[PDB]
TrEMBL record, chain D:
Binds to sialic acid-containing receptors on the cell surface, bringing about the attachment of the virus particle to the cell. This attachment induces virion internalization of about two third of the virus particles through clathrin-dependent endocytosis and about one third through a clathrin- and caveolin-independent pathway. Plays a major role in the determination of host range restriction and virulence. Class I viral fusion protein. It comes from Influenza A virus (A/Japan/305+/1957(H2N2)). Homotrimer of disulfide-linked HA1-HA2. It is found in: Host apical cell membrane; Virion membrane. The gene is HA. In natural infection, inactive HA is matured into HA1 and HA2 outside the cell by one or more trypsin-like, arginine-specific endoprotease secreted by the bronchial epithelial cells. One identified protease that may be involved in this process is secreted in lungs by club cells. Palmitoylated. The chain holds residues 232 to 286 of 562 of the full protein. This is Hemagglutinin. Belongs to the influenza viruses hemagglutinin family.
Length: 106, 54, 112, 55
């Protein structure tokens, strides 16, 4: 089980910015990574899969990028329904690890 | 694999023949696949056969 | 489009047992990778389970094996986890979900 | 051209065991059987390559 690290656990939602979450694994996983959205404290939801491609129930407002140990979930110009905690998760390896959360406000 | 072993070695392999296209796709993604094995003496390339069997 | 009906809400008292259900439709019984992720009061996210219907094989995390058994039935298109020895590192909300491809891909719907 | 024809029919064959099931599926060029032959009597026989007739 190969230990992610969503840095940092909370940025501060200054609207419109280059708001960029990071996800750094314990070892090389190449391109087998997913980004999940948790709007308010309930059922999560999937946005980006397989590092740099999009769910087609699609925001143009979002982005995924990465490969090595290091990954990035980008929102450019902020919008007022995207209030959530955020997750990176994995396979390649076998027992399915996550990140902890990255959460910002109004 | 180079046979660095210190004698001739028997090597077996196989090809999966699926029941339907749904199996084919949910196993290997794409269709019209191929399995190719070769040595110095050997050259084979099988194209798998989807079909409904007893 | 493909959905996912789970079970109840009832937490229980330590030493007991659970058998969360999760049946799906919107497609055929093969494919279907049934994954299950649990969410403690406030904390992170935690993969517990899985079942890969093509194989009939089933995968767990190892803070379990011993305890958890996951199954299914094609006829009822219904999954079935079973968490025994039910303490307090066992108390959460338990999401069923659908994923893809043997190595548990992305989980595309989720349970309520 | 054999018999006018520059085309050919390639025929193959099998024994189908008792309670076994034969399936043909094609999208072109099948020459299907209508009949099977059941082996009614088994025994030591032969085929003589003669060019004459029986008395």
């Amino acid at each position: 089980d190969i230990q992610l690290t969503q840095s940092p656990s909370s940025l501060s939602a200054s609207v419109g910015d280059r708001v960029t979450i990071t996800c750094q694994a314990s070892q090389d996983i190449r391109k087998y990574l997913n980004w999940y959205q948790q709007k308010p404290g309930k059922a999560p939801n999937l946005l980006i899969y397989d590092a740099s491609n999009v769910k087609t129930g699609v925001p143009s407002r979002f982005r995924g990028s990465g490969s090595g140990t290091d990954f990035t979930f980008t929102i450019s110009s902020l919008q007022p329904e995207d209030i959530a905690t955020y997750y990176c998760q994995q396979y390649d390896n076998l027992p399915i690890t996550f990140g902890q959360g990255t959460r910002l406000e109004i | 694999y180079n046979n660095t072993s210190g004698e001739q070695m028997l090597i077996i392999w196989g090809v999966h023949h699926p029941n339907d296209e749904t199996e084919q796709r949910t196993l290997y993604q794409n269709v019209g696949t191929y399995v190719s094995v070769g040595t110095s003496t050997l050259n084979k390339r099988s194209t798998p056969e989807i079909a409904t069997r007893p | 489009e493909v959905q996912l009906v789970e079970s109840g809400a009832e937490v229980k008292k330590p030493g007991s047992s659970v058998k969360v259900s999760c049946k799906a439709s919107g497609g055929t019984f093969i494919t279907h990778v049934f994954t299950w992720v649990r969410q403690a009061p406030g904390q992170g996210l935690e993969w517990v389970g899985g079942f890969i219907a093509i194989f009939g094989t089933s995968n767990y995390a190892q803070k379990f094996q011993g305890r958890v058994t996951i199954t299914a039935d094609e006829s009822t298109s219904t999954a079935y986890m079973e968490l025994t020895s039910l303490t307090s590192e066992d108390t959460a909300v338990y999401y069923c979900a659908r994923g893809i491809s043997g190595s548990y891909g992305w989980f595309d719907p989720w349970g309520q | 051209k054999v018999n006018g024809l520059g085309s050919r029919m390639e025929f193959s064959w099998t024994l189908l065991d008792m309670w076994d099931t034969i399936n043909f599926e094609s999208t072109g060029n099948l020459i299907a059987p209508e009949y099977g032959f059941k082996i009614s009597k088994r025994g030591s026989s032969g085929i003589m390559k003669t060019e004459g007739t029986l008395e």
